[PDB]
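Need tokens for this chain, all 100 residues.
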Amino acid sequence: MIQRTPKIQVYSRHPAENGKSNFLNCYVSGFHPSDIEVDLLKNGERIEKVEHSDLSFSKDWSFYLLYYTEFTPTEKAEYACRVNHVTLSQPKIVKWDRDM
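Here are the structure tokens for all 100 residues:
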């Protein structure tokens, strides 16, 4: 058996074909087992509609998840990603920094 804690990165991207649009991303990488719970949060509340959830694996024991959706960050509100995994005794919340 192997278990590996996810690395979690939270960032924003504009798709080059539609640069006025902005996407909030949570990239959860290198984890095992694959069982996981991932949410995007706005003011601590689960964003119910997340458009994209892309899961892959490299080696049989390393999984990668890109979880992302369109958003409009203003100076109002706080955004984050929350991850639950067997390796994490408490949920891990990683805040989005507007500079990322």
